[PDB]
Amino acid sequence: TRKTYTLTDYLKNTYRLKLYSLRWISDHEYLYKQENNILVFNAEYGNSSVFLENSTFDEFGHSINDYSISPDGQFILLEYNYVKQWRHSYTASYDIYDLNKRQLITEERIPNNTQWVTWSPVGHKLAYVWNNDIYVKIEPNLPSYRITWTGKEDIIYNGITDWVYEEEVFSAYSALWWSPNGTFLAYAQFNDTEVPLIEYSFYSDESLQYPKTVRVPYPKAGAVNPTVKFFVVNTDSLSSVTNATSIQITAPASMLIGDHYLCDVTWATQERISLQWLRRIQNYSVMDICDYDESSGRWNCLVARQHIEMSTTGWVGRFRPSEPHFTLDGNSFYKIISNEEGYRHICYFQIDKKDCTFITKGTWEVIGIEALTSDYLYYISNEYKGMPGGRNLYKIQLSDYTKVTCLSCELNPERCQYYSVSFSKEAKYYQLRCSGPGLPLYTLHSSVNDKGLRVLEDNSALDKMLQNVQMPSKKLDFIILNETKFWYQMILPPHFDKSKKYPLLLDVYAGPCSQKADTVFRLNWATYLASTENIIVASFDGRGSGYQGDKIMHAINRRLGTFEVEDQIEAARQFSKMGFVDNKRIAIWGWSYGGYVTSMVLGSGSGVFKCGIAVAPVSRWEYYDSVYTERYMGLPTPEDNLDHYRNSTVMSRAENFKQVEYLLIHGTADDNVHFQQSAQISKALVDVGVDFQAMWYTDEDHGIASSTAHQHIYTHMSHFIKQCFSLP
Amino acid sequence: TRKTYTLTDYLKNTYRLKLYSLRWISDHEYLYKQENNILVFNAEYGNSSVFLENSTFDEFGHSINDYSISPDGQFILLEYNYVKQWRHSYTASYDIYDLNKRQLITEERIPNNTQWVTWSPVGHKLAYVWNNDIYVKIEPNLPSYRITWTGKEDIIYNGITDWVYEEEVFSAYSALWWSPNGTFLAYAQFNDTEVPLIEYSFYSDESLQYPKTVRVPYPKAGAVNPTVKFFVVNTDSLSSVTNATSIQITAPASMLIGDHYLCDVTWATQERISLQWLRRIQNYSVMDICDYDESSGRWNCLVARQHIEMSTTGWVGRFRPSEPHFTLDGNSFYKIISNEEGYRHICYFQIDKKDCTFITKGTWEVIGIEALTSDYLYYISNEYKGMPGGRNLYKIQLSDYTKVTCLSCELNPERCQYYSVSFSKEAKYYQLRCSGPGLPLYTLHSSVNDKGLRVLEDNSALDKMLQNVQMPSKKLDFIILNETKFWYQMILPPHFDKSKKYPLLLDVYAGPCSQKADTVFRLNWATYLASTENIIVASFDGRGSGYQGDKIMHAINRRLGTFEVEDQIEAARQFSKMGFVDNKRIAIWGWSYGGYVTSMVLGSGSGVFKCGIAVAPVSRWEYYDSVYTERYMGLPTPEDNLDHYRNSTVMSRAENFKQVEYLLIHGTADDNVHFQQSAQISKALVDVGVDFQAMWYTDEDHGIASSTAHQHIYTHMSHFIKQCFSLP
Ligand SMILES: CN(C)C(=O)[C@@H](c1ccc(-c2ccc3ncnn3c2)cc1)[C@H](N)C(=O)N1CC[C@H](F)C1
Ligand SMILES: CN(C)C(=O)[C@@H](c1ccc(-c2ccc3ncnn3c2)cc1)[C@H](N)C(=O)N1CC[C@H](F)C1
Ligand SMILES: *[C@@H]1O[C@H](CO)[C@@H](O[C@@H]2O[C@H](CO)[C@@H](O)[C@H](O)[C@H]2NC(C)=O)[C@H](O)[C@H]1NC(C)=O
Ligand SMILES: *[C@@H]1O[C@H](CO)[C@@H](O[C@@H]2O[C@H](CO)[C@@H](O)[C@H](O)[C@H]2NC(C)=O)[C@H](O)[C@H]1NC(C)=O
Ligand SMILES: *[C@@H]1O[C@H](CO)[C@@H](O[C@@H]2O[C@H](CO)[C@@H](O)[C@H](O)[C@H]2NC(C)=O)[C@H](O)[C@H]1NC(C)=O
Ligand SMILES: *[C@@H]1O[C@H](CO)[C@@H](O[C@@H]2O[C@H](CO)[C@@H](O)[C@H](O)[C@H]2NC(C)=O)[C@H](O)[C@H]1NC(C)=O
Ligand SMILES: *[C@@H]1O[C@H](CO)[C@@H](O[C@@H]2O[C@H](CO)[C@@H](O)[C@H](O)[C@H]2NC(C)=O)[C@H](O)[C@H]1NC(C)=O
Ligand SMILES: *[C@@H]1O[C@H](CO)[C@@H](O[C@@H]2O[C@H](CO)[C@@H](O)[C@H](O)[C@H]2NC(C)=O)[C@H](O)[C@H]1NC(C)=O
Ligand SMILES: *[C@@H]1O[C@H](CO)[C@@H](O[C@H]2O[C@H](CO)[C@@H](O)[C@H](O)[C@H]2NC(C)=O)[C@H](O)[C@H]1NC(C)=O
Ligand SMILES: *[C@@H]1O[C@H](CO)[C@@H](O[C@H]2O[C@H](CO)[C@@H](O)[C@H](O)[C@H]2NC(C)=O)[C@H](O)[C@H]1NC(C)=O
Ligand SMILES: *[C@H]1O[C@H](CO)[C@@H](O[C@@H]2O[C@H](CO)[C@@H](O)[C@H](O)[C@H]2NC(C)=O)[C@H](O)[C@H]1NC(C)=O
Ligand SMILES: *[C@@H]1O[C@H](CO)[C@@H](O)[C@H](O)[C@H]1NC(C)=O
Ligand SMILES: *[C@@H]1O[C@H](CO)[C@@H](O)[C@H](O)[C@H]1NC(C)=O
Ligand SMILES: *[C@@H]1O[C@H](CO)[C@@H](O)[C@H](O)[C@H]1NC(C)=O
Ligand SMILES: *[C@@H]1O[C@H](CO)[C@@H](O)[C@H](O)[C@H]1NC(C)=O
Ligand SMILES: *[C@@H]1O[C@H](CO)[C@@H](O)[C@H](O)[C@H]1NC(C)=O
Ligand SMILES: *[C@@H]1O[C@H](CO)[C@@H](O)[C@H](O)[C@H]1NC(C)=O
């Protein structure tokens, strides 16, 4: 008896996971949505009031997609007409509402088709981007001040990122940074004038007679990259001059010699900004720390404050150089960098001294720095129990580094091993977000004494429901290879019995710094496959995976399509030798990098796998973007790494696909991994006479996240998997 | 005990039908290529001589695609560097070889990337089109005269057709017509200035980093059409000092009042040319007969010599107004037109007389006029035994229309019921090409007493091999629907046992004026399905089908996607009631128009079919080209026929696909039926949550004919059909 977790349950989302998303508006108050209306909460006592009743914007005539309150609480930014673009970019309309006089502002409005908008860090100043140009409003109802006049669609981007900077560098559309108290506005400018365009058809509703051709500047591996410049304007002078000057801060000579990237912007004080640059050969980066010269209104970065960060074994950072966290006075900062052993740790820097001091160490890594006060630095690491897949919050005493307290380890060790945190404005309070291995648990805490204030959401409602369902179990463990240990996890069917032979599906990602073996609780397709189809679903983090030191992460340096592919195959061998796996029913599947690796594995001729599914895969590195591809592969030229670029394609293994059952799937409007990539795979297969299954998804992008397509693709894949394992 | 016709046999052509393609060069001799050699045959006795050694160009360098001897046998055009474009268009390089002086002309040679070339009907003048302009060479080695200078890629076409005119009107790339003795050169000029462009990606070889975008002027239904002008230039009076003069012949006023097309051009004499114009609303056409005025130098088309052809029930002609066949003196002509009963017969016209006289009549139709002498007119019709799917050669005494003699009906009634013919210059001799129901038979005959001279090719070699294989049989019969008989054919498995239940596959086309039930012998996919898989393959010609009169053909006027779809379901319904059909295993498949009907059938909710396959189907008429679509559907505007355009889509029927298995295939480089069509279908299916099979063919067009793709698509569809029918 007791129903199992079925496909419909997953697709229809019957068993919902509750969460508690709050927004700190001060040092002890936060916002929270409870029944369409917005409540403000007093962190200290848990009491609240209705900040904005849901019926406030009833007769607005528009569905409000999101809202944003200015720092001073005097105004609220209403966003509507949301139109998604890439992963982070989108356009929308905006109206500003005056919270005091409870009126909606109807004059000097933010234009429609606005690309980005942000309040100043203090007060209620506004900066926005329209038609690729920057604008600043000192007051919600006053005319804007134009900052740039160069804006030009697909050519010059002021204050916003182009496709590649948005996707691979800043993971954001915005490229502007208000100084701490809002006086200055810094921004980047990108020029894609000579960047080659990716073009593909977009069909739209059937009412469109002629298909549309989407054209976006996108630099493939080895192609011409966009250039970039950085500026800073003093917004306090806008109302005093006709045309305020944007002062440029040039990149250091060590970068100007070749193609480079702006990879980080972080203010230190009211008059000090830090910038990190990265060479197109991403193994060398420089940080300039620039100060405002009040007598010249210029910005100067002293070479004595310049910091170099390079890697002899790979690229710099997990995906890019890490951000610095400055002490109040801006004279020192903390940054996560790889130590002599290859493990990322927190290094303490004096701004005008090149040698830093590590304040943490060990055979584990710091994930990120979360908060810094004058007494303590808080961070999340996977040190607890030597489990690279766990995450915990720690506190370290700035006056005595031997004093490190773990703030989350023992809170509920059996239910919570993967933590995330959110501090109030001055870090007086913090919300802990436990997301695994048990049901997510959200709690609020007081920083002054680290005492639990109360439980915010325990998901008791879901635990209630999950009691009447045969849920699968999860095993997180490791196997030893060449002395080093590699982690893996298994979603095991209910009432698992190791005396039996279960079919096994290898779920893979395996890209650089990836981690599929963790303690997070998930309700996904693997849940259904294990609970209903009694299939074991496994994942493995072999060479190239992250959070375990550069010896493992940089092993695939300049060699993608090798060790991370082979290790995935070896993983399957090890699992079968565990005795509860049916060597005759072993499948593999992956999306994105997972698809590439899955394809490479299905075409290796290993005989280990019976069938596999690749969704939106990369097929040859020269088809993917420069920033990401070159980071691990260097340049596709004969003097660099061309031979390996040409040796790591899926297409060259076409012939071996005769040994397996393959299902290739790709969205046609995929702007990230172009359909082109699967189009070349299918062609190579047709060319050598290989039969396989295929599915395209009209107008879907890399996420194939459209509600209907999402359900359609997981249904199609389920049939394929069930058939391959002949359940049925 | 004897093999069967396997899938590999069909894909590798192990069983080749022999042909005999000859080329008449006079009234008594023809050319035939044997062992790469070209021989000249004397029709009367059968003796031959070598005309050109297969080794004459043994050291030519390039691979010769094709040859073409000038009418006077003095020169030979060599074609190479062939590069295909659409259905008939291509560019190539040419070279001329002097047969007399056994030398290859090296001066003033045809340019590379030539779009079209042709000898004058007599002698050895040349006319070619390059970069959209027309050129003429009086002599192979002399410099050419530029006739036009307005030529512009994708914009102005002189002497060659644009996309729609190539595909739907002239079925050729050529748009120039030499006068009978080569004095005059007539040509059309197309302007696609305001024609929207269809755009789709082309991926090319794996090495191309960025997909290319193909753009071609293609008018979809209701869009802006290309305009056209007609010119005639005297090539006998060309000067190398002055730019050639082209005299324009404007269309009649009844045509200039609105959009229209030039649909036929046929010279009547050395100084008289005829042109047929067609209104955009394709049910009204006009023929002009224009004479050259020696003193004036202009071409005059007397209104008294105008001939109007219209239709009150549909469009004009089978696909377009038929071509006239003028008498020697050009004063009268014969032309196939629909008579008062709606049957296509030959009418005799006086050039300055409004009424024509039908010389044939009956409930059957003339397919084409093949030869005309002062005593007889030779034509092919399907009159014999009242079989609309049969074709025979007839001659009718021009002095007594009651004297009609069939020349092929009785030559071999059991083996031959479908003939084609090729007459020599003055109809002194004719070649008969029988293509069914038995193996193809080619014979030569003399007109004087209709003697059977000799057998050219009887395919006895193929017959010998076929006796060692279990070949299927063909049943051609008819069913009655409302006092009307409609024909069908069934390809029956070897040893057909009417006491057994066979699965059945409906092979459908069903387009307007289509015929899928004939007496033609074919070796195709259906042969393998029947011979090896024991599957009956049926085809049916319902309302909308051709060669049976307008009452049937015009049944679908302004109503595509209705009767022709309904009639296929009715046929299947009837076949499913026959004792030898397993009503639980009935499938349907089609390509092009057939893919549209197949999709409309699967989405009908009839419950008759278990599975179906659609290859490159049309999904909604507004996506297809204007000339073909509007011919049958009128314009897609509210005041015309928009409602039916919207009610006849595949998409609106998505929901009804839940009860069937559907496989949708399409080439991504299809310039005819754009990938868009299947893209909208898949998206609609996804939107209602209906699972299905799909396959795209990278860079393949509407014919998916490349060797690898051809083999791959039929392999994939075979797996699909066998699986649907539970066949090993
Ligand atoms: C998992 N994921 C989000 C990614 O893989 C995408 C990806 C996007 C952004 C980052 C990224 C960028 C900056 C950054 N600073 C700190 N972390 N951090 C991560 C890392 C990965 C990647 N651009 C992609 O879509 N493909 C597709 C093909 C290839 F596998 C990489
Ligand atoms: C079979 N065949 C060659 C066709 O169907 C194509 C087609 C092309 C040309 C003609 C055509 C044009 C002129 C003509 N003069 C005498 N016969 N004749 C036939 C008739 C049909 C059609 N343009 C097509 O490809 N689609 C695609 C979608 C729709 F089904 C029609
Ligand atoms: C939460 O509850 C407390 C306790 O009632 C409220 O405290 C206010 O405290 C200020 C200063 O300490 C006093 O001047 C007020 O009298 C108290 N509020 C009222 C309404 O009297 C606090 O306002 C509440 N906060 C929220 C967000 O509801
Ligand atoms: C963006 O970069 C392009 C170069 O890639 C710059 O364009 C050049 O501008 C100069 C100055 O007018 C011209 O002489 C060159 O011919 C231009 N080259 C090209 C390829 O266009 C452009 O100035 C930059 N734009 C901005 C705002 O910096
Ligand atoms: C504000 O100042 C900027 C920069 O000084 C002006 O931009 C220049 O505009 C001129 C012509 O309009 C161009 O030739 C320069 O190339 C521009 N420079 C830059 C950096 O864009 C801008 O036009 C000024 N705006 C106003 C209203 O005066
Ligand atoms: C935000 O920081 C800026 C920069 O320090 C402050 O502006 C300076 O204010 C001092 C007054 O102590 C003046 O002497 C300088 O001329 C100002 N510099 C500039 C560049 O404007 C600003 O006052 C701070 N804002 C707030 C609200 O404190
Ligand atoms: C093709 O026919 C044309 C037209 O009838 C012939 O050209 C005419 O020939 C006569 C007799 O020589 C001249 O008087 C006319 O002036 C010509 N008319 C034109 C328009 O040129 C031509 O001779 C014939 N060509 C051949 C090769 O016989
Ligand atoms: C040719 O076909 C057209 C379109 O069917 C006929 O024109 C009219 O079409 C509209 C609808 O589009 C009807 O309301 C009219 O009744 C049609 N007739 C007329 C005279 O307007 C047209 O009649 C047909 N021509 C011939 C010669 O049959
Ligand atoms: C076919 O045979 C005839 C003779 O039977 C060939 O001869 C005719 O043409 C020759 C030159 O082409 C002449 O030399 C003969 O005198 C002439 N004979 C007659 C009766 O006309 C003819 O050429 C042959 N044709 C081929 C293509 O071989
Ligand atoms: C081809 O057609 C175009 C129109 O479709 C002709 O140009 C016309 O349209 C122009 C703009 O589209 C107008 O400016 C003109 O009034 C008109 N003529 C010209 C010369 O522009 C164009 O001339 C045609 N070309 C030929 C060779 O006939
Ligand atoms: C068309 O192309 C061919 C090949 O390019 C030309 O022939 C010559 O080819 C040789 C090598 O094969 C080259 O060295 C020459 O430059 C080519 N041209 C000549 C004149 O020698 C041919 O000439 C071209 N003709 C036209 C009209 O484009
Ligand atoms: C807010 O709106 C919800 C509807 O989403 C309603 O159920 C709730 O009672 C409202 N609460 C208030 C305070 O208006
Ligand atoms: C934005 O669009 C709306 C809807 O058309 C329009 O009425 C409004 O005036 C626009 N606002 C601005 C600032 O352009
Ligand atoms: C950076 O990487 C390139 C490519 O391998 C290498 O040649 C160069 O020496 C590296 N620089 C450093 C500091 O390791
Ligand atoms: C001409 O060449 C072909 C193959 O290129 C060969 O089969 C044939 O024998 C040759 N012709 C003659 C007459 O030898
Ligand atoms: C012919 O016409 C073209 C374009 O109209 C012109 O450029 C060329 O010079 C002319 N040649 C002569 C010989 O008139
Ligand atoms: C006759 O048969 C046709 C189909 O051929 C059918 O649609 C129609 O309703 C029947 N009756 C008449 C009067 O045509």
Cβ burial, residue B357 (10 Å; 0-12/13-18/19+): exposed
Q: Which residues of B are catalytic?
A: 592, 670, 702
Instruction: Report, in this order, helix, strand and coil percent for chain B, each rounded to 5.
Output: 20, 35, 45
Those residues with Cβ within 8 angstroms of residue B177's Cβ, 6 or more apart along the chain or in another chain:
B185, B186, B187, B265, B266, B267, B273
Minimum-distance ligand to the CA of B152? Answer: 10
Interatomic CA distance for residues B696 and B702, integer angstroms = 12
Helices (H), B360-496: 460-466
For B313-325, the DSSP string reads SS-SSSSSPPPPE
For residue A522, the distance in angstroms to the closest alpha carbon of chain B comes to 25
**Do B523 and B378 share a structural domain?**
no
Instruction: Check: CB of residue A201 under 8 Å from CB of residue A190.
Output: no
How many CB atoms lie under 10 A from the CB of residue A502?
21
C-alpha atoms less than 13 angstroms from C-alpha of B722 in its C-beta half-sphere: 14
Q: What are phi and psi of B457, to 5 degrees?
A: -160, 125
How many CB atoms lie under 10 A from the CB of residue A396?
18
For B121-149, the DSSP string reads SSTT-EEEEETTEEEEESSTTSPPEE---
Minimum-distance ligand to the CA of B109? Answer: 11
How many CB atoms lie under 10 A from the CB of residue B446?
16
Which residue from A517, A557, A560, A519 is spatially nearest to A540, judged by alpha carbons?
A: A517
Interatomic CA distance for residues B279 and B225, integer angstroms = 12
Which residue from A51, A91, A44, A83 is spatially nearest to A69, judged by alpha carbons?
A: A51
Total domains in the fold of chain B: 2
SS3 B709: helix
**Do B5 and B21 share a structural domain?**
no
**Do B298 and B409 share a structural domain?**
yes
Resolution of the model in angstroms: 2.4
Q: What are phi and psi of B695, to 5 degrees?
A: -160, 130
**Do A280 and A172 share a structural domain?**
yes
Q: Distance of alpha carbon A479 from its chain centroid, rounded?
A: 28
C-alpha atoms less than 13 angstroms from C-alpha of B552 in its C-beta half-sphere: 27
For residue A319, the distance in angstroms to the closest alpha carbon of chain B comes to 25
Residues of chain B neighbouring A708 (CB-CB closer than 8 A): 686-687, 689
Q: Do B691 and A712 touch (CB under 8 A)?
A: yes
Indicate the helix (H) or strand (E) that contains A473.
Answer: strand A473-481
For A407-426, the DSSP string reads SSTTTSTTTB-BEEEEE-TT
Give Rg (Cα) of chain B: 26
**Do B21 and B4 share a structural domain?**
no
Going through A144-259 in order, the beta strands assigned E by DSSP cover: 145-146, 156-158, 176-178, 184-191, 197-202, 212-217, 227-234, 247-248
How many Å from the N-terminal Cα to the C-terminal Cα in chain B? Answer: 20
Preceding residues of all breaks in chain A (C to N beyond 2.5 angstroms)? none
Instruction: Check: CB of residue A108 under 8 Å from CB of residue A101.
Output: no
What is the DSSP-derived secondary structure letter of residue A166?
I
Q: Hey, whose CA ends up nearest to atom 1 of ligand 16?
A: B243
**Do A515 and A452 share a structural domain?**
no
Closest CA in chain A for residue B687 = A708
Q: Tell me the residue type at A445.
A: H
**Do A91 and A65 share a structural domain?**
yes
Which residue from A476, A528, A539, A530 is spatially nearest to A503, judged by alpha carbons?
A: A530
Those residues with Cβ within 8 angstroms of residue B222's Cβ, 6 or more apart along the chain or in another chain:
A209, B622, B626, B630, B635, B636, B637
**Do A133 and A121 share a structural domain?**
yes
Q: What are phi and psi of B71, to 5 degrees?
A: -50, -35
Minimum-distance ligand to the CA of B37? Answer: 15
Mutation test residue for ligand 11: of B94, B112, B117, the one with most atoms within 8 Å of CB: B112
Indicate the helix (H) or strand (E) that contains B605.
Answer: none
Write out the two tokens for A529. Answer: 């496959």
How many CB atoms lie under 10 A from the CB of residue A68?
15
Q: Distance of alpha carbon A203 from its chain centroid, rounded?
A: 29
Preceding residues of all breaks in chain B (C to N beyond 2.5 angstroms)? none
Looking up residue B718, the CATH number of its domain turns out to be: 3.40.50.1820
Cβ burial, residue A453 (10 Å; 0-12/13-18/19+): middle
Those residues with Cβ within 8 angstroms of residue A500's Cβ, 6 or more apart along the chain or in another chain:
A580
Closest CA in chain B for residue A636 = B209
Instruction: Check: CB of residue A440 under 8 Å from CB of residue A434.
Output: yes
Q: Do A200 and B209 touch (CB under 8 A)?
A: no
Interatomic CA distance for residues B679 and B673, integer angstroms = 11
Q: Do B683 and A689 touch (CB under 8 A)?
A: no
Give Cα separations from B457 to B22, B416, B523 (angstroms). 12, 14, 18
Residues of chain A neighbouring B687 (CB-CB closer than 8 A): 708
Give Cα separations from A37 to A53, A165, A279, A385, B207 (angstroms). 5, 36, 48, 42, 56
Indicate the helix (H) or strand (E) that contains A539.
Answer: strand A536-540
Instruction: Check: CB of residue B17 under 8 Å from CB of residue B24.
Output: no
SS3 B610: coil
Indicate the helix (H) or strand (E) that contains B644.
Answer: helix B642-647
Instruction: Check: CB of residue A618 under 8 Å from CB of residue A596.
Output: yes
Interatomic CA distance for residues A595 and A572, integer angstroms = 17
| Bridge partners (DSSP) listed for residue B40 | B31, B49
Q: What are phi and psi of B66, to 5 degrees?
A: -165, 165
Q: Tell me the residue type at B583.
A: N
Atom of ligand 10 nearest to the CA of B156: 27
Instruction: Report, in this order, helix, strand and coil percent for chain A, each rounded to 5.
Output: 20, 40, 45
Instruction: Check: CB of residue A432 under 8 Å from CB of residue A443.
Output: yes
Give Cα separations from A350 to A263, A337, B387, B665 (angstroms). 21, 15, 99, 65
For residue B676, the distance in angstroms to the closest alpha carbon of chain A comes to 7
Those residues with Cβ within 8 angstroms of residue B170's Cβ, 6 or more apart along the chain or in another chain:
B161
Is any atom of ligand 6 closer than 6 Å to the C-beta of A120?
no
Sheet with A332-338, strands from edge to edge, namely A325-326, A332-338, A344-350, A357-358
Q: Which residues of A are catalytic?
A: 592, 670, 702
Q: Tell me the residue type at A523.
A: L
What is the DSSP-derived secondary structure letter of residue B458?
-
Interatomic CA distance for residues A594 and A614, integer angstroms = 7
Which of B213, B673, B683 is the best residue to mutate to test the A interface, defined by the most A CB atoms within 10 Å of its own CB? Answer: B683
What's the domain range around A284? 17-459
Q: Which residue, of A459, A481, A501, is where some domain finishes?
A: A459
Residues of chain A neighbouring B716 (CB-CB closer than 8 A): 691
Residues of chain B neighbouring A686 (CB-CB closer than 8 A): 697-698, 708-709, 712
SS3 A565: helix
Is any atom of ligand 11 closer than 6 Å to the C-beta of B21?
no
Looking up residue B255, the CATH number of its domain turns out to be: 2.140.10.30
Instruction: Check: CB of residue A324 under 8 Å from CB of residue A349.
Output: yes
Those residues with Cβ within 8 angstroms of residue B398's Cβ, 6 or more apart along the chain or in another chain:
B359, B374, B375, B376, B377
**Do A513 and A436 share a structural domain?**
no
Buried-state track B657-671, b at ≥16 Cβ within 10 A, e below 16:
beebbbbbbbbbbbb
Instruction: Check: CB of residue B234 under 8 Å from CB of residue B249.
Output: no
**Do B116 and B250 share a structural domain?**
yes
Q: Which residue, of A459, A489, A517, is where some domain finishes?
A: A459
Give Rg (Cα) of chain A: 26
Interatomic CA distance for residues B619 and B606, integer angstroms = 19
Experimental method: X-ray
Is any atom of ligand 6 closer than 6 Å to the C-beta of A183?
yes
Q: Do A679 and B668 touch (CB under 8 A)?
A: yes
**Do B593 and B494 share a structural domain?**
yes
Write out the two tokens for A42. Answer: 């007093």
Give Cα separations from B224 to A567, B175, B246, B257, B626 (angstroms). 59, 21, 27, 16, 9
Interatomic CA distance for residues B162 and B217, integer angstroms = 8
Mutation test residue for ligand 14: of A260, A281, A308, A558, the one with most atoms within 8 Å of CB: A281
Q: Which residue, of B459, B476, B502, is where some domain finishes?
A: B459
- Cα angle B347, B351, B354; round to 5: 65
Which residue from A157, A137, A146, A178 is spatially nearest to A86, judged by alpha carbons?
A: A157
Instruction: Check: CB of residue B220 under 8 Å from CB of residue B246.
Output: no
Q: Is the dihedral of CA A462, A464, A468, A473 positive or negative?
A: positive
What is the DSSP-derived secondary structure letter of residue A657?
G
Interatomic CA distance for residues A661 and B8, integer angstroms = 21
Is any atom of ligand 5 closer than 6 Å to the C-beta of A243?
yes
- Residue that has been written with the tokens 């848990």 in this structure: A46
Total H helices, total E strands in chain B: 12, 46
CA dihedral angle for residue A107, residue A112, residue A116, residue A118, rounded to 10 degrees: 20
Cis-peptide, bond into residue A728, ω within 30° of zero: yes
Is any atom of ligand 6 closer than 6 Å to the C-beta of A269?
no
Interatomic CA distance for residues A23 and A627, integer angstroms = 33
For residue A500, the distance in angstroms to the closest alpha carbon of chain B comes to 31
Q: What are phi and psi of B304, to 5 degrees?
A: -60, -25
Going through A15-55 in order, the beta strands assigned E by DSSP cover: 22-24, 29-34, 37-42, 48-52
C-alpha atoms less than 13 angstroms from C-alpha of B49 in its C-beta half-sphere: 3
Instruction: Check: CB of residue A508 under 8 Å from CB of residue A589.
Output: yes
Cβ burial, residue B180 (10 Å; 0-12/13-18/19+): middle
Q: Distance of alpha carbon B462 from its chain centroid, rounded?
A: 27
SS3 B723: helix
Write out the two tokens for B189. Answer: 């000029």
User: For the packed helices B593-602 and B563-575, what is the interaxial angle rounded to 10 degrees?
Assistant: 70
Total H helices, total E strands in chain A: 12, 46
Q: Regarding beta strands A176-178 and A197-202, do their DSSP bridges make them parallel or antiparallel, or are they unpaired?
A: unpaired
Closest CA in chain B for residue A715 = B691
Q: Tell me the residue type at A133.
A: D
Long-range contacts of residues A261-266, Cβ cutoff 8 Å, at least 24 apart: A261/A165, A261/A169, A261/A225, A261/A228, A261/A627, A262/A169, A262/A188, A262/A228, A262/A230, A263/A169, A263/A320, A263/A321, A264/A320, A264/A321, A264/A323, A265/A177, A265/A186, A265/A188, A265/A230, A266/A177, A266/A323, A266/A324, A266/A326
Write out the two tokens for B266. Answer: 């046929």
Q: Tell me the residue type at A573.
A: R
Interatomic CA distance for residues A576 and A579, integer angstroms = 6
SS3 A362: coil
Interatomic CA distance for residues B93 and B111, integer angstroms = 7
Q: Distance of alpha carbon B127 from its chain centroid, rounded?
A: 24
Helices (H), A218-330: 253-256
CA A269–ligand 5 middle distance (angstroms): 30
**Do B35 and B6 share a structural domain?**
no
Going through B435-580 in order, the beta strands assigned E by DSSP cover: 441-446, 451-457, 469-470, 473-481, 484-492, 502-508, 536-540
Cβ burial, residue B623 (10 Å; 0-12/13-18/19+): buried
Interatomic CA distance for residues A380 and A421, integer angstroms = 8
- Residue that has been written with the tokens 């909710």 in this structure: B605
How many CB atoms lie under 10 A from the CB of residue B304?
10
Q: What are phi and psi of B163, to 5 degrees?
A: -60, -55
Cβ burial, residue A656 (10 Å; 0-12/13-18/19+): middle
CA dihedral angle for residue A552, residue A555, residue A558, residue A560, rounded to 10 degrees: -80
